[PDB]
């Protein structure tokens, strides 16, 4: 029945700027009886279950900062971070209690910063693995913002495809920055064939492409 | 020469009158009670002869008929029959003494009396008179037969009583002048009856149900009040008592019925409890039902149905405006003395009769009977208005919990004993209070008082 | 504090039964107004409440879901079980379990994550991302462990057993098409440590019951 | 006659 809207999607705040996030309901959950607004806000960090910042509209629970407040009543709500510390980072829920339990879709918060290239890392297939007869080689991007970056293989200048997966994590509660990794998977055959090994970086913060190479060989 | 034909009947009335018991109302009229003879002296043009009838014919209401037992047929004879009989206890010269009997089962009312002569193979037929009949509580075969006679005198004779008042803290009282024996009264309460729903709708039936003290006795619920039916009193517990009288102005109930009377059967303003209990007793004692006014201090007033007065809290502490079960500091209702033959012989005496609209039964403000007996013993599946008036008595107070995000609810406390204390009438010959909490349930507090509540409550 | 634990089977066939198991700690379901609930997530998906049983053992579901649902509990063991039909690779997700008060849904578990697929399980091998002048910049060196081929998910994976959390990043899994899953850790430490200091990578898979530890060991070149 |  009831159905629970968040807004923004998604929100980039400076470190120590005031973020909000709203929400809004089918129909009122304020139940007229006791006059309480029977909503509540949680937060979830990446890897982690959500945890419980406020119910009934503003009252905050036991041991959570005063910067996070909640505010509104009827059908539309509001959270508001006063100052956005670095480590606020994560995805805001909105539920309505009212009537059984629903959850808005979630809103992600993150740290606006400065651009800030990636530092590039490579590192050949282990001896241990070359026995089991593939070779996943590993290229590292490693603090980067923002997110979007972008990695290509050649292997002896041949441009690769269909054989190299990417992951990225999510942003960092400290240095407020993101890594990523390209894993290039071969047969040992081929890796036993070619010489040299290259990922290649796009990123904001270059004006031109970052290659980072080793040679195969015992150095 | 001459047909035999009627000069004159001398009813005796005086005599007839002291021996009926309704020697002491204010009235010119006959006034009789059923199951009872009465003598007559019918003085006629000659004697009898021995080829010649005498036939009676009695009926009250608008469409009497003899099926409905709202006619009757029957010859002069020497045998007494079971029905209406005359029996011929002497002939002087021309004038005849006569022995008339009416059936303990007749409907009360107004009736008519005429008399029917068969001779020189001719008929003939003369209206002689009218009387009244009233219920009969000295005859031990009425349904209202009440055998101890300081009970009867206080019950039935007694125009002035006692009713209690206040709460149970402040315990007082105020008197009360029921007046049934002052002028045009007993005619007005036979008036009600004419003017009921039961009545407007189907007079044939209704005249025929007279008979019936449990009949009587529930439209007398329904008609003391003005609801539905123009009744005779309207209740306001606003304060404000503009266009009318302040109900703690009231002393008795000849003023309420006369002006109910003189404006045309309109209702009169205003009554509470009380009020409505003390007419509807003057209704009662008129007619021949014995009854009293009780008093029950922390009335519940349940409204649906569940045998508990109910409030309601979040599981937090807030309080949840839900509900409309209430309770009353104290309110007033009767009892008349009638056997139940619809019910069993275990339930006869005291019944419940309340002409306050709280509740409406088969949509109408009407309240009982309700065996006394039976609500003592929670047996609320009988007739009439049990559950509502055991919660009267006996309700248990429960708060509730209540979680509005599941809806479940659950008990949080139970208060099983400060509904219905100190239930009041007043004494046979004083003016002392009566407790009468006893013949309403059992002991407060005890074990059988906890497994009726059960017991009733799945009679639901 | 109030503690909870999910529990049961990681991996599960199309077309049966799903039932998994709360425990928990801090406070007795046997206490009059006390409700445990369960919810679950599916990957990149909103949460969605599912079902939840009271102290006398009054229940509700998801209307949606009531025809799938089962709850117990038993207040003996503290522990509460649910029971969902026909698990579709739909109903892959974490399922939380969580306490109820007069409040909202206040205290969760950690969650186990519920795979629906017809595939076995299989443990990872571990190999090292060892530090060369290749993943050096600035007394910075770059380090790291690759478990590569398991299923189904989870892995855990630890530093020097925990002693070691400052710069380490753990990526997410990737399903390769092979139809294994496969992630990495890597941390960076300073260069001087290189030499003296020892870094031990710990990995645990419990579905298939694989722990290793794999030193990874600085190479020179 | 008064609501308690
Ligand atoms: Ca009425
Ligand atoms: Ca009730
Ligand atoms: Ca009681």
Same mark, same amino acid.
């Given at each position: ?73 009827? !059908?539309?709500? !509001? ?58 080689? #590993? ?28 992951? #990225? ?26 010489? #040299? ?13 970052? !290659? ?8 | ?57 009695? *009926? ?22 079971? =029905? ?33 002569? @068969? ?5 003939? *037929? ?20 009440? =055998? ?50 039961? @009545? ?75 009020? @409505? ?21 922390? *009335? ?87 559950? @509502? ?56 507090? *005890? ?14 | ?82 029971? /969902?039909?026909? /698990? ?134 | 006659?008064?609501?308690?």
């Amino acid at each position: 029945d009831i159905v629970m809207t968040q807004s923004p999607d998604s929100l980039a705040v400076s470190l120590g700027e005031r973020a909000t996030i709203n929400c809004k309901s089918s129909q009122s959950v304020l139940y007229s009886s006791n006059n309480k607004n029977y909503l509540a806000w949680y937060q979830q960090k990446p890897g982690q279950p959500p945890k419980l910042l406020i119910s009934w509209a503003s009252t905050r629970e036991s041991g959570v900062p005063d910067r996070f407040s909640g505010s509104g009543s009827g !059908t539309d709500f !509001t959270l508001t971070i006063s100052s956005l510390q670095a480590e606020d980072v994560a995805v805001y829920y909105c539920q309505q209690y009212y009537s059984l339990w629903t959850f808005g879709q979630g809103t992600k918060v993150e740290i606006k910063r400065t651009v800030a290239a990636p530092s590039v890392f490579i590192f050949p297939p282990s001896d241990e693995q070359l026995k089991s007869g593939t070779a996943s080689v #590993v290229c590292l991007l490693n603090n980067f913002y923002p997110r979007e970056a972008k990695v290509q293989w050649k292997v002896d200048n041949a441009l690769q495809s269909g054989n190299s997966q990417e992951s #990225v994590t999510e942003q960092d509660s400290k240095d407020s920055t993101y890594s990523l990794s390209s894993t290039l998977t071969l047969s040992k055959a081929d890796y036993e064939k070619h010489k #040299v090994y290259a990922c290649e970086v796009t990123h904001q913060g270059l004006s031109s492409p970052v !290659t980072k190479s080793f040679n195969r060989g015992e150095c | 020469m001459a047909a035999l034909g009627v000069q004159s009947i001398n009813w005796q009335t005086a005599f007839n009158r002291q021996a009926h018991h309704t020697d002491k109302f204010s009235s010119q009229e006959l006034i009789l009670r059923r199951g009872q003879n009465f003598q007559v002296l019918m003085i006629m043009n000659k004697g009898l002869g021995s080829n010649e009838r005498l036939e009676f014919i009695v *009926s009250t209401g608008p469409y009497p008929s003899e099926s409905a037992m709202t006619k009757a047929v029957f010859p002069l004879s020497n045998g007494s029959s079971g =029905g209406w009989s005359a029996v011929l206890q002497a002939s002087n010269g021309n004038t005849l003494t006569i022995s008339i009997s009416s059936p303990a089962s007749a409907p009360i009312g107004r009736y008519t009396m005429a008399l029917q002569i @068969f001779s020189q193979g001719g008929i003939s *037929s003369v209206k002689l008179g009218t009387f009244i009949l009233l219920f009969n509580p000295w005859l031990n075969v009425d349904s209202v037969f009440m =055998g101890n006679h300081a009970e009867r005198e206080e019950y039935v004779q007694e125009d002035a009583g006692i009713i209690f008042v206040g709460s149970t803290n402040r315990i007082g009282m105020i008197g009360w002048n029921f007046g049934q024996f002052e002028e045009d009264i007993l005619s007005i309460c036979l008036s009600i009856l004419d003017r009921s729903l039961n @009545f407007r709708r189907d007079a044939a039936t209704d005249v025929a149900s007279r008979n019936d003290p449990k009949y009587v006795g529930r439209v007398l619920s329904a008609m003391i009040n003005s609801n539905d039916d123009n009744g005779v009193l309207a209740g306001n517990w606003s304060g404000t008592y503009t266009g009318g009288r302040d109900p703690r102005s009231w002393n008795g109930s000849v003023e309420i019925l006369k002006n109910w009377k003189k404006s045309g059967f309109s209702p009169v303003r205003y009554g509470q409890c009380w009020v @409505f209990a003390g007419t509807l007793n003057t209704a009662l004692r008129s007619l021949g039902i014995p009854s009293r006014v009780i008093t029950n201090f922390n *009335s519940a007033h349940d409204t649906d149905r569940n045998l508990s007065v109910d409030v309601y809290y979040d599981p937090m502490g807030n309080p949840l405006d839900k509900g409309s079960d209430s309770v009353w500091n104290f309110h007033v209702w009767n009892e008349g003395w009638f056997v139940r033959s619809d019910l069993g012989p275990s339930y006869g005496g005291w019944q419940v009769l309340d002409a306050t609209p709280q509740e409406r039964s088969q949509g109408v403000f009407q309240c009982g009977p309700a065996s006394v007996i039976g609500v003592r013993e929670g047996d609320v599946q009988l007739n009439f208005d049990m559950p @509502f008036i055991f919660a009267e008595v006996n309700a248990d107070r429960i708060t509730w919990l209540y979680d509005n995000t599941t809806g479940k609810q659950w008990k949080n406390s139970v208060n099983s004993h400060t509904i219905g204390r100190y239930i009041s009438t007043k004494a046979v010959g004083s003016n002392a209070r009566m407790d009468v909490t006893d013949k309403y349930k059992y002991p407060e507090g *005890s074990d059988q008082e906890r497994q009726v509540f059960q017991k009733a409550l799945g009679k639901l | 504090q109030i503690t909870l634990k999910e529990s049961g089977p990681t991996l599960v066939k199309p077309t049966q039964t799903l039932t998994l198991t709360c425990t928990f700690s801090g406070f007795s379901l046997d206490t009059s107004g006390v409700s445990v609930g369960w919810i679950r997530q599916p990957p990149g998906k909103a949460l969605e409440w599912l079902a939840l049983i009271f102290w006398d053992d009054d229940k509700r579901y998801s209307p949606s879901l009531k025809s799938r649902l089962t709850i117990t509990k038993d207040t003996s063991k503290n522990q509460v079980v649910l029971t /969902m039909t026909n /698990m579709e690779p739909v109903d892959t997700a974490t399922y939380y379990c969580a306490h109820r008060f007069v409040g909202t849904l206040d205290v969760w578990g950690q969650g186990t994550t519920v795979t629906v697929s017809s595939a076995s399980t299989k443990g990872p091998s571990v190999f090292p991302l060892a530090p060369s002048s290749k993943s050096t910049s600035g007394g910075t060196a770059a380090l790291g462990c690759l478990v590569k081929d398991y299923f189904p998910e989870p892995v855990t994976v630890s530093w020097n057993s925990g002693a070691l959390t400052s710069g380490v990043h753990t990526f997410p899994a990737v399903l390769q098409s092979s139809g294994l899953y496969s992630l990495s850790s890597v941390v960076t430490v300073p260069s001087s440590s290189l030499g003296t200091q020892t870094y031990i990578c710990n990995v645990n898979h419990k579905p298939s019951n694989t722990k290793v530890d794999k030193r990874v060991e600085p190479k020179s070149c | 006659x008064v609501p308690l």
